Amino acid sequence: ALFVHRDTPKNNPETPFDFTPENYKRIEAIVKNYPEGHKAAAVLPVLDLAQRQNGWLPISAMNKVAEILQVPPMRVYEVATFYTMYNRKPVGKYHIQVCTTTPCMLRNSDSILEAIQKKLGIKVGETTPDKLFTLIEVECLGACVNAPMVQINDNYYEDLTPKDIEEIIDELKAGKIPKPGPRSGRFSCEPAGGLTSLTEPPKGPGFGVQAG
């Protein structure tokens, strides 16, 4: 979706943009982890540092990363166009990601889509008439083990139902953050049946191990 720059100022360098010297010390740690000789490989962590500084990134962020990492910026434009984290459009504060591919659609994701729609109001893919409620549906996030899943900003949410969805949207309006895990009890990815897994606290290194 519009993979050319197409300026529209509040963009179009030099946009006013700069970091914190504390963040520059973070950058020194980041290019201290990597070996010298191939110093330019830290484009992805430095640009994600820019993304978590400013939730959307302008092009002057990419020019600043080119200044710090001394390479021509076209590599940075490649990386910014390539991946999926780097939301190059200006979006709002909180960010809804409704994951649905293979188990998630058959575990009633359309009720989840309709719940997000008829509570939030705005159509899918768009934003809201302020910030902080940008909605996208996405492909697999990895946590396939449960209900069609919700990622808000570095927070996973499983075992969904429309009443819990209304709870989550009400608590976003009140600002209080829910738990970082699923719902319907089961504090981790559990067999919700009758403890089919290991039960007992194990022995350890004590029994017969082959020379160890």
Partner 1 sequence: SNLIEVFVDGQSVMVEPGTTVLQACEKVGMQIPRFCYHERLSVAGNCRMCLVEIEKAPKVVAACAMPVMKGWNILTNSEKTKKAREGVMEFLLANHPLDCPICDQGGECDLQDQSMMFGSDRSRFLEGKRAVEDKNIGPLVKTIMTRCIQCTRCIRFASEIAGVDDLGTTGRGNDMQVGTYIEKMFMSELSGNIIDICPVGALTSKPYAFTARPWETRKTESIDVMDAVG
Partner 2 sequence: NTTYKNLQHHDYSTYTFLDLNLDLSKFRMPQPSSGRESPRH
Partner 3 sequence: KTSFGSLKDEDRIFTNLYGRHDWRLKGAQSRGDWYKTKEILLKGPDWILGEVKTSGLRGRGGAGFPTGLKWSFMNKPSDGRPKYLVVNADEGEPGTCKDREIIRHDPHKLVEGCLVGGRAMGARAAYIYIRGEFYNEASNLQVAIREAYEAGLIGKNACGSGYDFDVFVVRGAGAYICGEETALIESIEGKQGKPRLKPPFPADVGVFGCPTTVANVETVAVSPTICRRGGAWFASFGRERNSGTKLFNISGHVNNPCTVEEEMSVPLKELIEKHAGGVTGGWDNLLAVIPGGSSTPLIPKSVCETVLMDFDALIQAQTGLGTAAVIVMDRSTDIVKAIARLIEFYKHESCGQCTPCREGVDWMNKVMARFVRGDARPAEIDSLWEISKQIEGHTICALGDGAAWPVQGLIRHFRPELEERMQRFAQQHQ
Q: Which residues bind partner 1 (CB under 8 A)?
A: 3-7, 59, 72-75, 77-78, 81-82
Among residues 39, 97, 93, which one has the least CA distance to residue 68? 39
Among residues 25, 84, 21, which one has the least CA distance to residue 51? 84
Residue 34 interacts with partner 2 (CB under 8 A): yes or no: yes
Residues numbered 163 to 192 that lie near partner 2 (CB under 8 A) are 179-180, 187-188
Answer for the pair 151, 112: CB distance below 8 angstroms, yes or no: no
* Count of residues near partner 3 by CB under 8 A: 61
Of partner 2, partner 1, partner 3, none, which one does residue 123 interact with (CB within 5 to 8 Å by kind)?
none
Of partner 3, partner 2, partner 1, none, which one does residue 65 interact with (CB within 5 to 8 Å by kind)?
none
Phi, psi (rounded to 5 degrees) for 181: -130, -160
Of partner 3, ligand FES, partner 2, none, which one does residue 117 interact with (CB within 5 to 8 Å by kind)?
none
Choose between 23 and 87: whose C-beta lies nearer to partner 1. Answer: 87
Which amino acid is it at 78? E
CA distance 74 to 82: 12
Residue 69 interacts with ligand FES (CB under 6 A): yes or no: no
Q: Which stretch binds partner 3 (CB under 8 A): 9-17, 19-27, 88-96, 202-210?
A: 202-210
In the block, residue with structure tokens 């940075």: 76
Residue 37 interacts with partner 2 (CB under 8 A): yes or no: yes
Question: Which strand ranges, in their side-by-side order, compose the sheet holding 95-99?
Answer: 134-138, 95-99, 150-152, 155-157
**Which residues share a beta bridge with 150?**
98, 157
Tokens of 4: 């050319």
Residue 189 interacts with ligand FES (CB under 6 A): yes or no: no
- Binding stretches for ligand FES (CB under 6 A): 99-102, 104, 140-141, 143-144, 148-149
